[PDB]
């Protein structure tokens, strides 16, 4: 489901297959390192600052759900445990560097959560500034002072 | 000499021309071909505001075709597969 | 004398006319304006 944009031999970010469109933030430079992906035409939304295209046919198992729902409590990236509360989703500083972008924020269950952009730091903590999903449409948090990884 | 009768409708309009001319005609063409254009530019604007109406709803996900019929021809035919 | 430059008559018929030019700059306008405050409702709604 997660797939490296590369800019010259170098990774930028990330692209992801979240439902059945194929996601990468708009802000990253190269072309996603995947033959099948990167001949595709994408449809840039700068509100959003994302960037999304549709899943080809026999890469449709490989996306990763989502979900508007989200209670208060813990959940899981690779770095480890995000943990949200008031609306925010949150980190130990220092466990989110940038080149994290697009990475996906998932629930016990599996289902993808929200897809990390930057982070802003406040010291201990650092609030994640994210895309997620709302009632049925997508949606941006962003903490002030964010730094866009 | 010539007569200019009124109509009608328009007909007589153009018979106008020969009565004081050379020109007049030619400016009015001028202007129904610049109100033209600005018909013209009207729907361009208005297929573009279209566009930013379905926008949103561009990504993916049920949630319209619903509103898409009623739905600006286009809306639909468009959700769906 | 007489000679110079328009316009003049012929009244009615003349408006007849003329009515039928620039309400489409109107609607379009309005439209126009009608989508910039859709626009900013999905803006808001972000």
């Known amino acids: ?149 | 000499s010539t007569n200019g009768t009124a109509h009608g409708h328009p007909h007589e309009i153009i018979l106008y021309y020969y009565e004081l001319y050379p020109t007049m005609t030619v400016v009015i063409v001028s202007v129904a071909s610049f109100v033209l254009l600005s018909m013209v530019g009207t729907a361009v604007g208005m297929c573009v505001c279209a566009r930013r109406r379905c926008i949103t709803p561009y990504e993916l996900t049920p949630g319209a075709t619903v509103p898409f019929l009623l739905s600006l021809l286009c809306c639909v035919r468009t959700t769906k597969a | 004398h007489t000679t110079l430059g328009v316009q003049d008559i012929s009244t009615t018929a003349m408006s007849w006319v003329q009515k039928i030019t620039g309400g489409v700059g109107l609607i379009v306008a309005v439209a126009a304006l009608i989508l910039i405050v859709v626009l900013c409702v999905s803006f808001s709604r972000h």
């Open chain 1, 1 to 149: 489901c997660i797939f490296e944009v590369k800019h010259e031999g170098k990774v930028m970010g990330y692209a992801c297959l979240v439902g059945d469109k194929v996601m990468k933030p708009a802000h990253v430079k190269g072309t996603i390192d995947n033959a099948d992906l990167a001949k595709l035409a994408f449809k840039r939304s700068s509100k959003y600052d994302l960037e999304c295209a549709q899943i080809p046919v026999h890469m449709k198992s490989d996306a990763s759900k989502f979900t508007h729902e989200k209670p208060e409590g813990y959940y899981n990236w690779h770095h480890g445990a995000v943990q949200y509360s008031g609306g925010r989703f949150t980190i130990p500083t220092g466990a989110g560097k940038p080149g994290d972008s697009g990475r996906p924020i998932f629930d016990n269950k599996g289902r993808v959560v929200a897809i990390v952009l930057g982070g802003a730091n406040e010291g201990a903590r650092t609030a994640l500034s994210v895309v997620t999903w709302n009632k049925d449409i997508v949606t941006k948090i962003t903490p002030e002072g964010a730094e866009e990884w």
